[PDB]
Symmetry: C4
């Protein structure tokens, strides 16, 4: 079976109450659609009012300088667009015209107010900054001061902060319960700092996120040899608020069994030049292999505790 | 007595400082109300200014092409709606007219700015996306790798994420204190992942939320037999931010004693077809019963610890 | 010395970089101020451009139907307010006029866009909903299933939720360190659910917040008799997001030594009528006294542990 | 090597997918840029439409009172700015003109709606309130009721709250792993209240943040004498939401080895005058030295435990 989350963040799952917010069905779409639909609803109000204008216009013979429905449209414009050329002006004789304008004048400033709002949000869409946050292309497993770690690397490309940025990881893997319940893409959390507040990053330059593999880690029992065989996939989530706007964004990625590398280790990406720190974004995804025991974290521990014991 | 929260999210409780924010009294209402009140306040400003316009107009005899108060309204329009037909134009002779326009011109662009804002928020109301988040219709109680669990199922229907989505549960049940204090619909939290960060979901496909029933669970003492008799109600809360807009939404639901099912178990809703995961939303609320001890979680434990002991 | 926070939420403390956000100096003010300043800056742009218009107008003799600076103002209006009467129209002969309009036309739609924004936020100010959240007028201390508690009561008046609502408390009291450092209004946290997630409320009807007084509570050593003498003040903070808008609000209050009541107990405010829960907001602040040991929580404990011991 | 974060908050690090949000590349810039670019895109639409207007205008000979491209611009204005002088009015004879206006009329109210939005956010930028939050200029190390502390001081200058304000600290220092991995500006968290909820401030007057130096602190092994030699830098982060708007802001600062002062102690900044608390912001950064053991926190402890032991 094939992966839940694509390396780039989109998921591999497809799914009446979408009119309960006819708002959000709009915001997901793409530009040329909106631009036309904007016009669609803009165009139609001019038909709608232009028909109703001609409805009370035909009854009359409130109207100056018109000939057909070609003029009911261009009058409907001088109104809603509040252009008002003053060639086709309003006149007093009839008691019907004013209160239609009043219907329109308000409604035309409603159609605008509705649709400055949606434009704004479309522009301001947070998910866009999900582009300028990046993950390393592989995760690695290797030793760090005695304990075995699973490490992936995280980055922010834009010169400005993404405030309140945290991270979490989820292990996805089907399992069976002693009882017999199969649970298809079951999700359990991976400790990446939660308990100390170390998962609350400070993302000014690329950081290495490190999950230590201990009795509670999923990778406790997994040795180098077993790893390739294992059918797990690690989902990785960076969440934070765009300094620029309070908008709260999220960046996902994924590691599948074959993208975790046993015994390797990230290239450093930092150096100092004339007062600024230099990120060599070339070295970002790069890793190298070092000497790394091949045993599971568990077997590795016992070999330690037998040493201290003797 | 009858339930606190309706399966759909509204609560069964009814309640001077509502003018301390005359803002929020507006936003709760329904469309046809606003649409009229918008017009109400729109219409009245044209009366108000039109009266005041005629006030200084009568004194004059700043005014061109008017006859009655029929013209003070249509002039009041060419101003506020900034239409300005140029049939009824301003003129210099009087020192009074300009500074009224200046009162209006600003105020007309105030009445707009006020009421693009409220339109926007009404459109953008987060609570709307509370529709596209769903809970299972029943909760169940059954075994999962040895420990007894209370499980309900949670979903997101819309193809897009609801960011930073967490969950919590509250047990509502009246109680008495040794002391004698009766406490009517008293609320205590149910562990659904809080301590590990497992309550911080990743809601891409329906998940099963599971509260393990241990010494600290409310359901420690409750056996299958006792359950029907118990007068509890579990309130369930999903909170998160709409990816689309930073708006922070909340979805509630409820389980009452008779909607928890002992010994059952959710149907899986997942399958893989040609590269996409298939949610069979038909199987969403569906459960089946499996073999499940009928004892309380407590009695079930002791029977275990007596086994290990011997 | 006198209290830090007034029962109503304002604090009793008074305080170059206020132009680093000339934004927020604006939003704190009151309506009549804005309304005038709006006009102030609106009025002045018409002077400013009207002077500059007459500057290039005098040079000319781009201009139709003007006499003095009375017309440079009313032309400056038909421009910025985009009214454009078409009595005073633009003309081609001069190469200077168009690019000033272009300066203005853009700037007039800037002055608007600037000041729809601030209007909006002023309207939408979250702190307003700090009015519809209420605290009980007193806190009490009395027993709850064996342990001694400090309890105050919290409410939401508006029929709609305030999402993600939590609570915290701070103990304020000057102290001295063995070392000798005096620390004037020093602040330490009071446990009101933090460790279990019980401080994350569900505020649909008034709840009683309860801090159990244990070895870690500030009130461990304080007996009934000592209480009046103690110079402490408890600050109470309710934080949450307005369901209506993502705006994140905060409601404070305070308890000083003499407003905590030993041995009392809140009146219940709940009852059920024909399917709706009835909050008797009359009974909201009301308490009564019950039988309550007068000893400190500490002395009360030891008397227990000596009992179990024997 | 030189510091990661400047005392004022900017970092000392410099860094295709910046068009994936051409939104945020805009908001970082400075006023005079926007003001011109606004005009840039405003000016060009009048060229663009004015050319296209003349395109179908030349074909004609929909047009009244024009001479060259000087009029195609001033007509393009009476349209987009919705000024509509009514000297140059629309006419019926041609079937081409109306649907271009309809292209424009909508697009002109799009260019506006786009660029009220960005104006707004630029105005409302949260990072601005990062100016009115301040840190003390030095941190100090000295005793507080027996335990050794690292303390820095934090403030809010503006009379209004910054809601939900928390604090965290990061220790930055390169290190080597037994294994051999060098890790250049490696980041580990410093406890400043996280575990008790004491890092969740109530910032009404300047507070002293205190990290107790215990077995888990980085400063466990560091004595007064060693301190100057150590190459560490403490990064300090205040995060919270502007009461005024939900915008979520962040304020950083930094302490390098030589800005931590062993044996000193902050001057109190509080006093009471006629009912208001007086902050003497003069005493804000000020410290004095007191009698302070010079040993590391570790050696200091053992000397204690040897005392209790005997
Ligand atoms: K914690
Ligand atoms: K927000
Ligand atoms: K107009
Ligand atoms: K106009
Ligand atoms: K006009
Ligand atoms: K925790
Ligand atoms: K916790
Ligand atoms: K006109
Ligand atoms: K905690």
């Amino acid at each position: 079976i094939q992966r839940y989350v694509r390396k780039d963040g989109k998921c591999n799952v497809h799914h009446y109450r979408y009119l309960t917010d006819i708002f959000t069905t709009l915001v997901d779409l793409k530009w040329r659609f909106n631009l036309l639909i904007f016009v669609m609803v803009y165009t139609v109000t001019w038909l709608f009012f232009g028909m109703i204008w001609w409805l009370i216009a035909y009854i009359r013979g409130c109207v100056t300088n018109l000939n057909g429905f070609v003029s009911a449209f261009l009058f409907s414009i001088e109104t809603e667009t509040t252009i008002g050329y003053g060639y086709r002006v309003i006149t007093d004789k009839c008691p019907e015209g004013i209160i239609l304008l009043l219907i329109q004048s308000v409604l035309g400033s409603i159609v605008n107010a509705f649709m400055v709002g949606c434009m704004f949000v479309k522009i301001s869409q947070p998910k866009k900054r999900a582009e300028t946050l990046v993950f390393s292309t592989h995760a690695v497993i290797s030793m760090r001061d005695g304990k075995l770690c699973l490490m992936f690397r995280v980055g922010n490309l834009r010169n400005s902060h993404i405030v309140e940025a945290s991270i979490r990881a989820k292990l996805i893997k089907s399992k069976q319960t002693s009882e017999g319940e199969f649970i298809p893409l079951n999700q359990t959390d991976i400790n990446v700092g939660y308990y100390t507040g170390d998962d609350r990053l400070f993302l000014v330059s690329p950081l290495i996120i490190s999950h230590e593999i201990n009795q509670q880690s999923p990778f406790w029992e997994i040795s180098k040899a077993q790893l390739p065989k294992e059918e797990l996939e690690i989902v990785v989530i960076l969440e934070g608020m765009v300094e620029a706007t309070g908008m709260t964004c999220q960046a996902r990625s994924s590691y599948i069994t074959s993208e975790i590398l046993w015994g390797y280790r990230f290239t450093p990406v930092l150096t100092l030049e004339d007062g600024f720190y230099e990120v060599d974004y070339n070295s970002f995804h790069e890793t190298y292999e070092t000497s790394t025991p091949s045993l599971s974290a568990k077997e590795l521990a016992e070999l330690a505790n037998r040493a201290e014991s003797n």
